[PDB]
CSV table of C-alpha atoms and ligand atoms in Angstrom, one decimal:
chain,number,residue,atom,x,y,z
A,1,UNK,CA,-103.7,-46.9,200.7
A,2,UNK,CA,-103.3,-43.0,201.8
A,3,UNK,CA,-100.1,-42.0,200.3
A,4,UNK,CA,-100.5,-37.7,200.9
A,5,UNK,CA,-97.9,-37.5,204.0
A,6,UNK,CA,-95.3,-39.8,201.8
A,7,UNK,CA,-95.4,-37.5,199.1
A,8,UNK,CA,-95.3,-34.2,201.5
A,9,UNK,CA,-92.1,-36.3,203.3
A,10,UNK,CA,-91.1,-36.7,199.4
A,11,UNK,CA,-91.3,-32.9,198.4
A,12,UNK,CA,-89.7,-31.3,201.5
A,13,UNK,CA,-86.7,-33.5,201.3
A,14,UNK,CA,-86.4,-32.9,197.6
A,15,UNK,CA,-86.6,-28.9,198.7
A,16,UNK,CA,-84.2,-29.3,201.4
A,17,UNK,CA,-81.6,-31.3,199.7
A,18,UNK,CA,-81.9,-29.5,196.0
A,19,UNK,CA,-82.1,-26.5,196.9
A,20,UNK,CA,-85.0,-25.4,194.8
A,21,UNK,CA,-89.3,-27.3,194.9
A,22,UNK,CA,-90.2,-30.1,192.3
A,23,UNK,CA,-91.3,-29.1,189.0
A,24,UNK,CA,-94.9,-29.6,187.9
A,25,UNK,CA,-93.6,-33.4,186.0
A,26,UNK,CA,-91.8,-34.1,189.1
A,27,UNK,CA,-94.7,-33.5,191.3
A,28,UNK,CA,-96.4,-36.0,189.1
A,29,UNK,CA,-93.3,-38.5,189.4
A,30,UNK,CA,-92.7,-38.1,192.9
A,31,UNK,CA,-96.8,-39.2,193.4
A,32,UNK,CA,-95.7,-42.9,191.8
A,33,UNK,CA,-92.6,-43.2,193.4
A,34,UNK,CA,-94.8,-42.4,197.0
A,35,UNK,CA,-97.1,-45.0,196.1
A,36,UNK,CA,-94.9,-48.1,194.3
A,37,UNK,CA,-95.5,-47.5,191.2
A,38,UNK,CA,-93.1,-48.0,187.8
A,39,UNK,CA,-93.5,-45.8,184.9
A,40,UNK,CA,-92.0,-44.2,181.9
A,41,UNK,CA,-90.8,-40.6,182.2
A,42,UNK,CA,-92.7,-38.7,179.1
A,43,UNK,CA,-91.1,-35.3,179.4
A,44,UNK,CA,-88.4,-33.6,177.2
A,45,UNK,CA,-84.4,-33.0,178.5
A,46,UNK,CA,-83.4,-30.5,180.9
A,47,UNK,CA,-86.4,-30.9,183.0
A,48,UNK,CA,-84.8,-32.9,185.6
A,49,UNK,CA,-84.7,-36.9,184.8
A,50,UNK,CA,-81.8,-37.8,186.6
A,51,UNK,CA,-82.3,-35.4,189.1
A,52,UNK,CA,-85.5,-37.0,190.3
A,53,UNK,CA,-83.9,-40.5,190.0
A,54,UNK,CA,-80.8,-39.5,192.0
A,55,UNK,CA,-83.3,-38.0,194.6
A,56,UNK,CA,-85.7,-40.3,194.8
A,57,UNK,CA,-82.8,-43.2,195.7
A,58,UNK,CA,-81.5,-41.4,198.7
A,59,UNK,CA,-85.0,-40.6,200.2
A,60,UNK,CA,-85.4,-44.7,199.7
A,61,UNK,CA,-82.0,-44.9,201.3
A,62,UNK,CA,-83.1,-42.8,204.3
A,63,UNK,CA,-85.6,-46.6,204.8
A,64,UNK,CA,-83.1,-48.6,204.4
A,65,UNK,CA,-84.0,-49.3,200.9
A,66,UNK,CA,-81.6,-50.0,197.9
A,67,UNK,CA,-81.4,-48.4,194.7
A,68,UNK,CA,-79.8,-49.1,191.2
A,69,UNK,CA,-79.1,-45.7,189.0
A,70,UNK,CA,-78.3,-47.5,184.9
A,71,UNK,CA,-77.0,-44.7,182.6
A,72,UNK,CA,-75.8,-45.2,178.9
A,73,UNK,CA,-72.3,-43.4,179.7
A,74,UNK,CA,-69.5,-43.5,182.1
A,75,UNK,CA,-69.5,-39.6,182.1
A,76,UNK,CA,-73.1,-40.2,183.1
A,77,UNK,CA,-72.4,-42.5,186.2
A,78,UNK,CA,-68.9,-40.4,187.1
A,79,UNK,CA,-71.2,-36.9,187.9
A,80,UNK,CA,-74.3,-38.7,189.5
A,81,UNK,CA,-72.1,-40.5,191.7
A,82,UNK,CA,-70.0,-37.6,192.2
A,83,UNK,CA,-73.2,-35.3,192.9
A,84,UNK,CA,-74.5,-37.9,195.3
A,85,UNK,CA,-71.3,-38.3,197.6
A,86,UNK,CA,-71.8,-34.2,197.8
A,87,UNK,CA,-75.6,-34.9,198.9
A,88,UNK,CA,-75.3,-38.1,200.9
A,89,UNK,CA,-75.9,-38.0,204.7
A,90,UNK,CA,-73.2,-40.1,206.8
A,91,UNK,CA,-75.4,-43.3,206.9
A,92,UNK,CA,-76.2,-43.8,203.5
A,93,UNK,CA,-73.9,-46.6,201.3
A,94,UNK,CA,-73.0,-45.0,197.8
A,95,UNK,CA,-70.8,-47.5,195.5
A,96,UNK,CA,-70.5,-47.1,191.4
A,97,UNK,CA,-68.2,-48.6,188.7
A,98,UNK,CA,-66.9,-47.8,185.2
A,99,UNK,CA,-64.2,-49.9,183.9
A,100,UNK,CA,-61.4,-47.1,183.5
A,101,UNK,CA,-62.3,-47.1,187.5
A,102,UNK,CA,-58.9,-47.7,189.7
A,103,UNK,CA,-58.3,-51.3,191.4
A,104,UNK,CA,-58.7,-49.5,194.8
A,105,UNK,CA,-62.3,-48.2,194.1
A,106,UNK,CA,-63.5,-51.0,191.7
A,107,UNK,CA,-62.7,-53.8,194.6
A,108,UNK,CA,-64.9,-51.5,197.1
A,109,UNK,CA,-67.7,-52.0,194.8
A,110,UNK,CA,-67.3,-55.9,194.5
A,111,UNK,CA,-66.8,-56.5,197.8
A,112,UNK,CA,-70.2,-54.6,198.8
A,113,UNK,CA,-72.2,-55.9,196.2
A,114,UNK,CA,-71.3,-59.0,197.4
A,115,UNK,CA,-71.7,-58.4,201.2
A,116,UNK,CA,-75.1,-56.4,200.3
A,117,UNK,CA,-73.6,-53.8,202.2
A,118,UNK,CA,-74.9,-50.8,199.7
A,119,UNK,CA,-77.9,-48.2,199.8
A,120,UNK,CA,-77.3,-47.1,195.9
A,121,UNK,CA,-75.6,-48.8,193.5
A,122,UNK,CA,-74.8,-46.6,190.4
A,123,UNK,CA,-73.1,-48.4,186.8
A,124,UNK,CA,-73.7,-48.5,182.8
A,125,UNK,CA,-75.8,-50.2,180.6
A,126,UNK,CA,-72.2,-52.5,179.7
A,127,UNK,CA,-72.1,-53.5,183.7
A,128,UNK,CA,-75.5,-54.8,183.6
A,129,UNK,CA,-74.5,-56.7,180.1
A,130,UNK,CA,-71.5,-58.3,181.3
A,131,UNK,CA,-73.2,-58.8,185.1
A,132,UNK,CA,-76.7,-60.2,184.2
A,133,UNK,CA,-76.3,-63.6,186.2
A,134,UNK,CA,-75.2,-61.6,189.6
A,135,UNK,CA,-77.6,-58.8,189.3
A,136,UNK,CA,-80.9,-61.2,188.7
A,137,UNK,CA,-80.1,-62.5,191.8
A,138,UNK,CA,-80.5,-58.8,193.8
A,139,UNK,CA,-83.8,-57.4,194.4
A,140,UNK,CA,-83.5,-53.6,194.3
A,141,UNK,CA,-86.5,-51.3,196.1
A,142,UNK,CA,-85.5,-49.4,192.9
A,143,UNK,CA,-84.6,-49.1,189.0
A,144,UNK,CA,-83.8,-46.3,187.3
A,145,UNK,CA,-82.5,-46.6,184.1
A,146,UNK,CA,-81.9,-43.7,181.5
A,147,UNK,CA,-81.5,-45.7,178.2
A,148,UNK,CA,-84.5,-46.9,176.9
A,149,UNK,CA,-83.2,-48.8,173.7
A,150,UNK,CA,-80.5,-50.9,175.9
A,151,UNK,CA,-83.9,-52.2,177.6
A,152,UNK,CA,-85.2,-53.1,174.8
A,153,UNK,CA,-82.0,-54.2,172.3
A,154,UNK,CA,-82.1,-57.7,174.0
A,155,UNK,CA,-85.0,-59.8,175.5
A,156,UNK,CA,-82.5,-61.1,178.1
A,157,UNK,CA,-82.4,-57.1,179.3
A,158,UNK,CA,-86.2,-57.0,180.0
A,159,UNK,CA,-85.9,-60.3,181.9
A,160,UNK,CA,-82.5,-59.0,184.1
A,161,UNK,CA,-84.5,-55.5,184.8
A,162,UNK,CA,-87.5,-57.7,185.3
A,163,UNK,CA,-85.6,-59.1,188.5
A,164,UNK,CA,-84.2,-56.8,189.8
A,165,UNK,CA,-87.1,-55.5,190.9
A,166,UNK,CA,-87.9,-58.5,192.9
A,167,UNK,CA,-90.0,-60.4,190.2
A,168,UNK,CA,-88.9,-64.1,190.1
A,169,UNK,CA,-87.7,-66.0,187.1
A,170,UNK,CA,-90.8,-68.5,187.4
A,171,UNK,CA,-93.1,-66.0,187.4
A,172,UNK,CA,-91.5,-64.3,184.3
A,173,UNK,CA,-91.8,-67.4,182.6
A,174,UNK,CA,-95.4,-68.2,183.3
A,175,UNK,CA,-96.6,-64.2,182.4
A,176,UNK,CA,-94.9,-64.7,179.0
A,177,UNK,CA,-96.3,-67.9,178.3
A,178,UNK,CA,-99.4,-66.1,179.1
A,179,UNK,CA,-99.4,-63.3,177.1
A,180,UNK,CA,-98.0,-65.5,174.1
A,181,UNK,CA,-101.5,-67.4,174.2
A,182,UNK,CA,-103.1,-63.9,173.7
A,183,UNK,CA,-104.2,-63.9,177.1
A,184,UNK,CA,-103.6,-61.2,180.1
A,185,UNK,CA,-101.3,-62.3,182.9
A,186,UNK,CA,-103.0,-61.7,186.6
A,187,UNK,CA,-99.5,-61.2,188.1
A,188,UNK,CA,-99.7,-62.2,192.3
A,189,UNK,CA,-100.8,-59.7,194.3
A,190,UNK,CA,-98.8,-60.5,197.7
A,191,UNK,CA,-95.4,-60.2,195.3
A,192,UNK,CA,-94.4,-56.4,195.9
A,193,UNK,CA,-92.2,-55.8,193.2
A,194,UNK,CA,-89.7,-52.7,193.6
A,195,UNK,CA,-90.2,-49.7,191.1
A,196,UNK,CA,-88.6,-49.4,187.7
A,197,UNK,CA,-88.7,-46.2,186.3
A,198,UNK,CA,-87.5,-46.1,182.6
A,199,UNK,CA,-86.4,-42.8,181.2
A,200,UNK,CA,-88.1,-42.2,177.7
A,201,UNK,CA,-90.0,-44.3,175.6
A,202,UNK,CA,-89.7,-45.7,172.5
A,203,UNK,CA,-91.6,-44.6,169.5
A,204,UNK,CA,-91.3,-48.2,167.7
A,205,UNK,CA,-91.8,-50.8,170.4
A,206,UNK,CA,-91.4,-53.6,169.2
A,207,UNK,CA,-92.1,-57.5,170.2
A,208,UNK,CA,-94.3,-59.5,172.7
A,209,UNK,CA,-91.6,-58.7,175.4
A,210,UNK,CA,-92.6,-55.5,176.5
A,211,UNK,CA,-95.9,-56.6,177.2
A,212,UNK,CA,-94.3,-58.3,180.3
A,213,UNK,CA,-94.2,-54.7,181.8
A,214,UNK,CA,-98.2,-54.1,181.9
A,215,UNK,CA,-98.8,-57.4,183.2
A,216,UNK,CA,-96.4,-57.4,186.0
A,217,UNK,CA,-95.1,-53.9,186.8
A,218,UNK,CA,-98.9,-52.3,185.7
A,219,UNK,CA,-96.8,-49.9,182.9
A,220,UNK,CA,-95.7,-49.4,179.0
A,221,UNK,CA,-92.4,-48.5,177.9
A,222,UNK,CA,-94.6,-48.3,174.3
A,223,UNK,CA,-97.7,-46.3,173.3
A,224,UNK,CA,-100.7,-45.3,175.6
A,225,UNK,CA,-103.4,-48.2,175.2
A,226,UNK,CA,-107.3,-46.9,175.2
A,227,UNK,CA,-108.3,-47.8,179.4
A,228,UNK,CA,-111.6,-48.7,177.4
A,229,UNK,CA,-113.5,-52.1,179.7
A,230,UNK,CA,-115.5,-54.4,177.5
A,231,UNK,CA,-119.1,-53.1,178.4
A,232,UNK,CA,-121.5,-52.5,176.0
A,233,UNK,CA,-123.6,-49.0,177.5
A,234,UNK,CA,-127.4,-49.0,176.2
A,235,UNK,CA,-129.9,-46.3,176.6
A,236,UNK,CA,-133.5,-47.2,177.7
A,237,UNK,CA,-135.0,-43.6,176.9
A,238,UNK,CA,-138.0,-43.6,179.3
A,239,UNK,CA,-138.5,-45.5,183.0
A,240,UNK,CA,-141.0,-48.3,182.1
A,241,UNK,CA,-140.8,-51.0,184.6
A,242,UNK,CA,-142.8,-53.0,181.6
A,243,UNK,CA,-139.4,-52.8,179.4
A,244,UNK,CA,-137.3,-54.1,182.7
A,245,UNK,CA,-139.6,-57.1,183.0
A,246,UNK,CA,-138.7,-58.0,179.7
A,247,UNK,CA,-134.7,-57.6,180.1
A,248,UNK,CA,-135.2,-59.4,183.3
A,249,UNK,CA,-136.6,-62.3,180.9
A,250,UNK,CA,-134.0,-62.8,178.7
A,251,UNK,CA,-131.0,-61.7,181.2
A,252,UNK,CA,-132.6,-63.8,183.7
A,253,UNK,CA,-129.4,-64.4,186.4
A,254,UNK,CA,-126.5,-61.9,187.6
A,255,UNK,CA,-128.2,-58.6,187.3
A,256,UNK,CA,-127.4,-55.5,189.4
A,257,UNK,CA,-130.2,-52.8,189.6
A,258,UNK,CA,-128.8,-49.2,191.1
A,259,UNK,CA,-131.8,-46.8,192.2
A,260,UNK,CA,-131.1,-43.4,192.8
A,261,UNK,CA,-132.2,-43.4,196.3
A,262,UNK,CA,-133.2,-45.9,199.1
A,263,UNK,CA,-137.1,-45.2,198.5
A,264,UNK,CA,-137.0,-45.8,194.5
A,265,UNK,CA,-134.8,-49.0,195.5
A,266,UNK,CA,-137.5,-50.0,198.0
A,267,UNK,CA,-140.5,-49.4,195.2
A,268,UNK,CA,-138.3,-51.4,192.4
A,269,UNK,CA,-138.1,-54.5,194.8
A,270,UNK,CA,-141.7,-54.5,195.8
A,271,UNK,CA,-142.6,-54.7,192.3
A,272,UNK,CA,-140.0,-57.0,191.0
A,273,UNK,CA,-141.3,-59.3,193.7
A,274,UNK,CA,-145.0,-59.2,193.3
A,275,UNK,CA,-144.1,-60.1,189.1
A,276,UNK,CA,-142.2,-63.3,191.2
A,277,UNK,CA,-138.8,-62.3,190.2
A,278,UNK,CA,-136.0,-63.9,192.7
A,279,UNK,CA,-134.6,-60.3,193.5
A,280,UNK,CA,-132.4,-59.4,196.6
A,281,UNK,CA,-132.1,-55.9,198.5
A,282,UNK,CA,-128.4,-54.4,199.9
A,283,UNK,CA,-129.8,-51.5,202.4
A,284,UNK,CA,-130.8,-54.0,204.9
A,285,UNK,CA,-129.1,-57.2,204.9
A,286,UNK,CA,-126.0,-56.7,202.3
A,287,UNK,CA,-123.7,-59.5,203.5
A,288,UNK,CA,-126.1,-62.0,203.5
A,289,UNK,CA,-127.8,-61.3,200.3
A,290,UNK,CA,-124.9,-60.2,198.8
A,291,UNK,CA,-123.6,-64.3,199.6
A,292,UNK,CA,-126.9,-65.3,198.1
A,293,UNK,CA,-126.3,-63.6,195.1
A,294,UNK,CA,-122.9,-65.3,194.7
A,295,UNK,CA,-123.6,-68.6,195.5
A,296,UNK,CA,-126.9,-68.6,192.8
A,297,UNK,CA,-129.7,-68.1,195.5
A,298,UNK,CA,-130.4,-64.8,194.2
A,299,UNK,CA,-130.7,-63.8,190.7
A,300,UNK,CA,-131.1,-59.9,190.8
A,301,UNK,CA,-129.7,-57.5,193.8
A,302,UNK,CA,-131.1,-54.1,194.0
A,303,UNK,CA,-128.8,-51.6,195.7
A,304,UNK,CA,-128.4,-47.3,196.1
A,305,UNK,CA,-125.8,-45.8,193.6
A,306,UNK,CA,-123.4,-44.1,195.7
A,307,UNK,CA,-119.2,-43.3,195.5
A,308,UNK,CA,-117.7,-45.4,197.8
A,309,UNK,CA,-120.6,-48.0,197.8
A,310,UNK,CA,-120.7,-51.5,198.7
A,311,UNK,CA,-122.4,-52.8,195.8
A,312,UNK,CA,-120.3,-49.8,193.3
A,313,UNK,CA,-117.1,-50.4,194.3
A,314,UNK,CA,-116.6,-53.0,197.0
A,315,UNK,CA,-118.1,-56.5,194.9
A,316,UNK,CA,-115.5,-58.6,192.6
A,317,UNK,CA,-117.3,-61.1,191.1
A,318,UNK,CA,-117.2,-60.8,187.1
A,319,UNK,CA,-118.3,-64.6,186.9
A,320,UNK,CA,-121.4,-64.1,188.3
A,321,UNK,CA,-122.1,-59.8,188.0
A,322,UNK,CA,-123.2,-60.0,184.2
A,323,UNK,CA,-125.7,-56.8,183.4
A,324,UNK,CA,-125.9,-53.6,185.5
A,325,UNK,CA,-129.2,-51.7,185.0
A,326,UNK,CA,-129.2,-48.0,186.2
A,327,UNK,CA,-132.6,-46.7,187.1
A,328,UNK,CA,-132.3,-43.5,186.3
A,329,UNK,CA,-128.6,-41.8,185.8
A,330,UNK,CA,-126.7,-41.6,189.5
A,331,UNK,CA,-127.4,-37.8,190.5
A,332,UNK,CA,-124.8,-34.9,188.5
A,333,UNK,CA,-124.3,-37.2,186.7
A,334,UNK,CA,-121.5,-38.9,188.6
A,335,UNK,CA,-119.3,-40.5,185.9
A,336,UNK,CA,-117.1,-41.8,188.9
A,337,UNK,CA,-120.0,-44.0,190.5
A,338,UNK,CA,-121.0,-44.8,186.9
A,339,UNK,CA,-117.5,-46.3,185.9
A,340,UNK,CA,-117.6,-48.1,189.6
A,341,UNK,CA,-120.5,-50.4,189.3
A,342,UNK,CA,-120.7,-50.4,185.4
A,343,UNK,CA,-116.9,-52.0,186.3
A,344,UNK,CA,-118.8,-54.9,187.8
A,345,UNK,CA,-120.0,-56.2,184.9
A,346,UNK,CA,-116.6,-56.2,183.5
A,347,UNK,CA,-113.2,-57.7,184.5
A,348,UNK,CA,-110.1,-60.1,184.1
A,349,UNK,CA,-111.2,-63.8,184.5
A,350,UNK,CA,-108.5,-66.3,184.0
A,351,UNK,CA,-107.0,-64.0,181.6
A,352,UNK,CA,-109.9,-62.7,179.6
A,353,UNK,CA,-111.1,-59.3,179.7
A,354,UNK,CA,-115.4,-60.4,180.0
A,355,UNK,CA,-118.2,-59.1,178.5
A,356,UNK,CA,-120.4,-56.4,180.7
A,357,UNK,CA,-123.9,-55.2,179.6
A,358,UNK,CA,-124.6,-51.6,181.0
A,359,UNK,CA,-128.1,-50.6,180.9
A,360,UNK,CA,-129.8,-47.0,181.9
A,361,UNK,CA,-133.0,-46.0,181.9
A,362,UNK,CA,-133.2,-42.4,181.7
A,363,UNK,CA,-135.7,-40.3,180.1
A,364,UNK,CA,-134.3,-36.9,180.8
A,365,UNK,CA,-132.3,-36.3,177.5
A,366,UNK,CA,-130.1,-33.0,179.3
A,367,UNK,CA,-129.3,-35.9,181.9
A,368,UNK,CA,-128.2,-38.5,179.6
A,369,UNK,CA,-126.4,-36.6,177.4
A,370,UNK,CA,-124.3,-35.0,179.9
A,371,UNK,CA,-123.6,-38.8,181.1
A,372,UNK,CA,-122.4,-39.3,177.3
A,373,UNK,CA,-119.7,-36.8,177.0
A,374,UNK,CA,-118.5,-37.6,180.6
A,375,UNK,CA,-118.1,-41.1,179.9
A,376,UNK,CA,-116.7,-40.8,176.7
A,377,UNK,CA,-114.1,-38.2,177.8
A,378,UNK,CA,-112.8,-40.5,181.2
A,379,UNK,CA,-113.2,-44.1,179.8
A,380,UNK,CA,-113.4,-43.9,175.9
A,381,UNK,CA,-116.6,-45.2,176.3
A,382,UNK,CA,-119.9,-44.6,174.2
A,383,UNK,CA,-123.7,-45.3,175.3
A,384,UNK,CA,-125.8,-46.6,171.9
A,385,UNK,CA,-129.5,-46.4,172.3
A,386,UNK,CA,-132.0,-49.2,172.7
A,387,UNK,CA,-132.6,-49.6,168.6
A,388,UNK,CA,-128.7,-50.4,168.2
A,389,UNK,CA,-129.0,-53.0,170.9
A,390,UNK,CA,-129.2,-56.9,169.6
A,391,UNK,CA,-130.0,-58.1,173.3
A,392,UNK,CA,-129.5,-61.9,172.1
A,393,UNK,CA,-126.4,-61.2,170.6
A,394,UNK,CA,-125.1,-59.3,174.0
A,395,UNK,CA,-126.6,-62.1,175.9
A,396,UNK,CA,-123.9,-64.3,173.8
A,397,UNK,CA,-121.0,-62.0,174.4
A,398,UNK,CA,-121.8,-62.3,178.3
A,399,UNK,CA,-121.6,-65.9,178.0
A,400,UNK,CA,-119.2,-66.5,175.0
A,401,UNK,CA,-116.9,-64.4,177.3
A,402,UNK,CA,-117.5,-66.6,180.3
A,403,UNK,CA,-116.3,-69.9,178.5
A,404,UNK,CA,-113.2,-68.6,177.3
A,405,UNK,CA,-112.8,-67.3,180.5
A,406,UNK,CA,-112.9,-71.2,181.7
A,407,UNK,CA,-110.7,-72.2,179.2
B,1,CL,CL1,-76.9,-31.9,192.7
């Protein structure tokens, strides 16, 4: 989903209504907020936290959409609200509460909180305490809470935070029961949760309960986890179509070959089908063979590395797409279309991260190791070569992976 005129609509608003451009982490914020996402703030103080929150609720309110601004302090919610009622346009719905609050202003917050007749709603980490029951009932376009530890001091805090976004209790439940097994929860992708945006992190996370937030809000609160897939890259250090025969034996079902061009992928398939291989081609007739492949017809698909490629990107099969063989290294090299379709091989089945076997065949050793560093440097990822490789043992892992998968 394009997302660049969003972000342009963000940054001139934020111009026009602070006075002054978003700063190089706020550029980087303001991206997310554009897009759906829910993150951690990692940035020092004075760089403008609350700032971005209180900005980025009344562009939201501009839509129509509803924010929630948490702070630690009543000082904290007295100034934002106070600097927002200055900013506010003559639409938008600005409520907050502190309990040294009059009866006067405390009663027009409860009766629009009620009525859901609010844009931003702005209170303490003790409201959301004493009003967990009420507030898990509200689903909030936005959540922006400063303290970190209040999160994370009760379980019960995730959960409330957890709904206010939109994220129902039953679903809550089933992810941790999930991720208590030791598997990953697959939250549901038609669910369009709101965005939480927590204001530091904490240095000892601690529990199974903040796990929660990577399954269903794609984030940590925590430290930075390795974006490492579980492929195994191998290095065939010449093109010998006599060493792919013998892969193609012992592999024998769900293998993806990508040829550099449509004339090498045309050569490999004449080959592969005069040795009686039961190989399939994606230049001509992809959505058929592609189905053939998927249903068992086909045991091998030849295809043309390429960026935005059908058979690079577009296929999500990790049940069936087992072994990805590059015949030679896709042109620069392209790390990005070599991440793609090596991704193939590797994703989450019923709450398993599978086994993918990743093998090139390049005999240009400037080439390959280029391809090394690359990979290595985007997805923490290292090639071995061919005498490291135990090709029954990977074999298992595909498979082993694949049960427990089922399970
Ligand atoms: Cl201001």
């Amino acid at each position: 989903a394009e997302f660049w005129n969003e972000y342009e609509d963000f940054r001139s608003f934020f111009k026009k209504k602070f006075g002054k451009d978003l700063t190089g982490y706020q550029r980087l914020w303001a991206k997310r907020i554009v897009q759906g996402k829910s993150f951690t703030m990692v940035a020092p103080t004075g760089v403008g936290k609350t700032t971005f929150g209180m900005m980025t609720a009344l562009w939201l309110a501009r839509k129509g959409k509803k924010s929630a601004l948490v702070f630690p302090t009543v000082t904290l919610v007295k100034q934002t609200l106070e600097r927002l009622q200055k900013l506010a346009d003559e639409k938008v719905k600005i409520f907050g509460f502190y309990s040294s609050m009059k009866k006067e202003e405390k009663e027009k917050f409860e009766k629009s909180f009620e009525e859901d007749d609010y844009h931003i709603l702005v209170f303490s980490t003790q409201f959301v305490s004493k009003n967990r029951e009420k507030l898990s009932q509200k689903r909030f376009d936005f959540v922006f809470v400063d303290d970190v530890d209040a999160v994370l001091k009760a379980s019960r805090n995730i959960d409330t935070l957890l709904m206010m976004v939109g994220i129902p209790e039953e679903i809550i439940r089933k992810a941790f029961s999930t991720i208590k097994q030791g598997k990953i929860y697959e939250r549901p992708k038609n669910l369009k949760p709101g965005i939480l945006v927590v204001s530091s992190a904490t240095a000892k996370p601690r529990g199974i309960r903040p796990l929660l937030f990577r399954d269903l809000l794609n984030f940590t609160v925590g430290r930075l986890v390795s974006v490492a897939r579980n492929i195994t890259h191998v290095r065939i250090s010449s093109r010998s179509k006599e060493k792919l025969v013998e892969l193609l034996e012992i592999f024998r079902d769900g293998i993806l070959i990508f040829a550099q061009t449509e004339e090498e992928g045309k050569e490999l398939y004449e080959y592969l089908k005069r040795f009686k291989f039961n190989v399939g081609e994606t230049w001509s007739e992809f959505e058929k063979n592609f189905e053939d492949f998927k249903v068992g017809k086909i045991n091998i698909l030849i295809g043309v590395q390429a960026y935005y490629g059908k058979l690079t990107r577009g296929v999500d099969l990790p049940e069936r797409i087992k072994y990805v063989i590059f015949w030679g290294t896709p042109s620069g090299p392209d790390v990005y279309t070599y991440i793609q379709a090596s991704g193939r091989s590797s994703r989450i089945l019923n709450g398993v991260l599978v086994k993918g076997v990743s093998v090139i065949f390049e005999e240009d050793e400037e080439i390959f190791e280029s391809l090394k560093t690359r990979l290595l440097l985007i997805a923490e990822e290292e090639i071995i070569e061919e005498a490291e490789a135990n090709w029954k043992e990977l074999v298992h892992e595909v498979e082993e992976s694949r049960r427990r998968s089922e399970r």
